[PDB]
Point group: D2
Chain length 236, copies 4
C-alpha cells in the first residue's frame, strides 16, 4: 500500500534479499532491495552524520554518510520523483532491530524543501531539531519510537539499563505534509541531515536507520521489523 523512497543506513547484511556482504548505505525506490549501495564503515558507539540531497535539475538522489576524521561513504541514483511519489508526502526517519539489535538514536534532524513555480516565486519548508522533547507535537511517532530521554529520539526500544531490544521498529514523521514536486515548478529541491548514534553489545548489530519519504498517511507495515527497516511489508 505505501509508496516509499528512502536512503538506508543498513547495518546488517541480509544477503538473501540483495544486501552486499557488508554494512552499507543504499537508495531504496519502492523496494527494500536497494537500487544502489555503497560500502559503509559503521562505527559502533560513535556519532555519525547523514546528508541527503535531491534537486529537480539533475534528478539525482544522493547521500553521504560520515563520521569525524573518517572517509565518508556516498551513494547516488538518478530517479525522477515525479514518477515515483505523490506530489504531497511526509518525511521521516525509521529504524528497526531483529534477532540482532542496536540503539537507533537520533541526536538531530533537519530538512528543507523548496518549490519554484513555472508561472510565478518559491514556496519553502525548513525545520530543525537539535534537541527532542518529551512531548514533541510537531512529530508523528509510530511504533516503538520515543522522545525526551536525553533530548534525543530513540527510534527503536531501549530498556531501563540502556540496552537496545530486539524485534523493535519505530518511525518519526514531520507533522506537516511537504509538497515534494509540482509539474508547474521550474526548480524543486530538498535536503535532509541527521546525526545518529548506533551502539550494540553484539559483534553483529542490526538492522539500521533510514530517511524516507512517503505518502502522507504512511504507517509502519505490520511485521516490518528486522531487515525490512519499518519501511516495507516484504522483501520484494
Amino acid at each position: 500500500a505505501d509508496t516509499i523512497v528512502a536512503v538506508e543506513l543498513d547495518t546488517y547484511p541480509n544477503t538473501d534479499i540483495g544486501d552486499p556482504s557488508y554494512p552499507h548505505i543504499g537508495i531504496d525506490i519502492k523496494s527494500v532491495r536497494s537500487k544502489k549501495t555503497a560500502k559503509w564503515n559503521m562505527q559502533n558507539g560513535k556519532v555519525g552524520t547523514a546528508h541527503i540531497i535531491y534537486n529537480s535539475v539533475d534528478k539525482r538522489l544522493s547521500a553521504v554518510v560520515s563520521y569525524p576524521n573518517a572517509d565518508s561513504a556516498t551513494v547516488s541514483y538518478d530517479v525522477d520523483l515525479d514518477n515515483v511519489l505523490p506530489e504531497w508526502v511526509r518525511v521521516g526517519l525509521s529504524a528497526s532491530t531483529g534477532l540482532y539489535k542496536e540503539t537507533n538514536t537520533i541526536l538531530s534532524w533537519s530538512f528543507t524543501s523548496k518549490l519554484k513555480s513555472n508561472s510565478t516565486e518559491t514556496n519553502a519548508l525548513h525545520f530543525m531539531f537539535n534537541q527532542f522533547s518529551k512531548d514533541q507535537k510537531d512529530l508523528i511517532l509510530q511504533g516503538d519510537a520515543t522522545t525526551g530521554t536525553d533530548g534525543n529520539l530513540e527510534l527503536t526500544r531501549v530498556s531501563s539499563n540502556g540496552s537496545p531490544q530486539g524485534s523493535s521498529v519505530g518511525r518519526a514523521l514531520f507533522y506537516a505534509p511537504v509538497h515534494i514536486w509540482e509539474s508547474s515548478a521550474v526548480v524543486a529541491s530538498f535536503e535532509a541531515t541527521f546525526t545518529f548514534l548506533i551502539k550494540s553489545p553484539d559483534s553483529h548489530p542490526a538492522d539500521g536507520i533510514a530517511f524516507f519519504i512517503s505518502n502522507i498517511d504512511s504507517s509502519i507495515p505490520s511485521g516490518s521489523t528486522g531487515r525490512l527497516l519499518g519501511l516495507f511489508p516484504d522483501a520484494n
Copy 2:
C-alpha cells in the same frame, strides 16, 4: 475557550466594543478589545504588507503594516507569551466580513520560529508565495479557499472577485509550533504576509488578523463581522 494572541488589521471601527474611530492595527491578547492600537490608513485596492515580530528578550510583540511609498503604521505591546499561550500552538491568518464586506485576499505568507535550549536551536520556517488548489500544509477553516490566481482567499468572494457579507475563514499551518519553552535561553518569531483588501463599499469591513492559538483552535461559533474569526464574544 480557545486562547488567542493576534495582530489585527481592523478595517471597521466598532466603537460600541472599544475600537477607535478609524481603521487601525492592534494587538489582541485573549480579547478582541486590543491592548494597544495605532491608526492605519488602509488603501482600498492596493497590496499591503504586514510584518510581526516577537522575541523573548524584550518580550515585546510588534507589528508594522505598510503600502509602497506611504508611511507605515506600527504597534507594540509588552507581553510575556510564556504566561498567555500554551507551550505548543498553531499559527494562522483569519478574516471576516459582516454587514459590510471586503476581499480578504492573501498573496503571500511567511513565518519563522526559533527556540534556543538552556542545555542549540530548534527552528521552523515556512514560505508561501503561491497557494495551490490543494494546499495540504494548510488547515482551511470556514470560508477560506485556495487556488484562485494562486491566492488564499480568507472570506467568500464570487467568480469575479466580488466580496460577500457574513463570511469568516482562517488558514492555519499544519504543524504545531514550539513557541516557548522555559528552558530556552532565547525564543523568537517573525511572520510576514501580503494582502489585498478591496471593497465596492464606502465602509469596508471587517479585517485580517495574524494569530497564534491553541493547536486545536477553530473558528468560534458566530464570530463573523467584528469578531474577526478569533473570539466567541466582544468581552
Copy 3:
C-alpha cells in the same frame, strides 16, 4: 591569467569560436568555448531567471534558465571544482556588448555557499539583492557596470535615452571572498540565482550575461568586450 568558471547566457552565436548557431547557455571552464551547451530561447524585453547549482557529492555544475510560461533551458556538466578553482574565490556577474548590443540589466541576485568540515560543523555565506542602490558598498563594480538606476544593476553601458551601447563590458563582484572548496570538508555546495532583463533594438542582440567564479583579485581582461563576455582574454 585569471581562473574562471562560469555559466554563460550567450545571446550571440559566434560560430567561428565554437558557439552553436543559436542563443544558448553554457558551462565554461577556463575557456569561453563552453564545455557543454543547450539551446536557449532568449526572449527580448522579458524578465528571465537563472539558477545555478553545485555540490561536492555529485560534482555537477548545473544551470536552468527560464521565463514565465515558457519551457526552460537547462545545462549540466561534471567538473570537480577542487581541481579548477582556488580554494577562495569571488563570485560575480559579467556582461558584454560588441558591434551588436543589448541591455544587460540585473534585477536581483542571490548566492549561498556552505562548507561542512571533516573534523568539526558548517560555515555558510548568503547574500540577497532584490534591489541595488547608487552606492552599493558590498559590490565591487568593474568596467562599465553601474547601480542605482531603478534600483537595478546595469552590467553594460546604457545611454541617457535608455539605448544600450555597443562595445561595453562590466562586472559586479560580491565584496567578501567565498571559501568554495576545502579538502577537509565532508560536503560543500553553492547556489546562485539572478533575474535579468535583456532588451535590444538589434535584429541580432549581443553578447550575453554570465555568472562567474574567479580568483579573488580577478579584473576584466583588457579587450574582453563582445564574444569574450568580460571573462576571458582570448577565444582559446
Copy 4:
C-alpha cells in the same frame, strides 16, 4: 575618530571610568562608558554564548549572555542607529587585555542583517581556518589554532598575555539601515571561552559595528577593548 556601537562583555571593573563594581555586559554607544549595563557572572574557563538583536521597529538594541544551566544576563537600550551609525558599516568582534589577562577565544560567530525597501546578508563561522580570507584581522587576532579565532595573544599552550588587543571584522560592508526601508534588522551570535590563571581576569570581548574603515585605536589595549581612543 571611528563611530562605534558595541556590546561589551566587560570582565574587569574600571571604576575610575565608570564601570560598575563587577563583571557586566553593556551597550556602548560611541563611548566606553556604557549607556546601560547589567551584572554578569563570568564563568572562568567555560564556553559562553552571546546573542545580540536589534530591529528598526522597536529600535532597541538588546543582548543576552549565558552559559549552559546558569541564569542569563540581559541588557537593552533604545537607540535609533539611523542617527548614530553611517548607512554602511562593518561588523566585528574585539577583545583586549591589559595588566591583567585572559583568553579571548571565539569558537563560532554568526550574523544576519535584513533591509526591506528585502536585501540580506548572512554569515556563519563554526570553524575558523588558518587563512580566513573573509575576515579582516587587526592587531593580535589570529585564526586556525584548534579552528578558533583568538582575538588576543595566547602562547603555544594557550596561556594568555597582557597588553594585547585584536579584532576580526567581516570582510563585506553591511547596509545596516536605509531611510526608505520599512523594516531593518540584525542579529549576531558568538560563542567564547574566557579562561585565566589570574584571580582577576581582564579586559573583555565586544561585538561592534563601525565605520567600514575602522581600525584599532592607538593605545586601546586594556579597558578600552580595542574600540575607543580614550575613556570619555
